[PDB]
Amino acid sequence: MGGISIWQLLIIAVIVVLLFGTKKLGSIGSDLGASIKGFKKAMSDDE
C-alpha cells in the first residue's frame, strides 16, 4: 500500500478502451454493466 489510487487505474483502463476499439466494452461491458445495477440492488438503503 502506497500511492495506489484510481489515478493509475484510469490511465491503463482508458488506453484499453481504444485498444480494442470499444468492441470489448460494448459487449461484455454492457452485460456486466447491467449486472452492476443488479448486484448493488440487493445491498442498498433508502427506498
Added chain:
Amino acid sequence: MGGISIWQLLIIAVIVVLLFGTKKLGSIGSDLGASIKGFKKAMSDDE
C-alpha cells in the same frame, strides 16, 4: 510472481484483452458478469 494487487492484475488484464481479440471477454465475461449480480444478490448485508 505477480501477487494479488489490483495494480499488477490490471496490467495483465489490459494485455489479455488484445490477446483474445475481445472474443473471450464478450462471451465468458458476460456469463460470469450475470453471475456476479446473482452471487451478491444473496449475500447482501449492506457492506
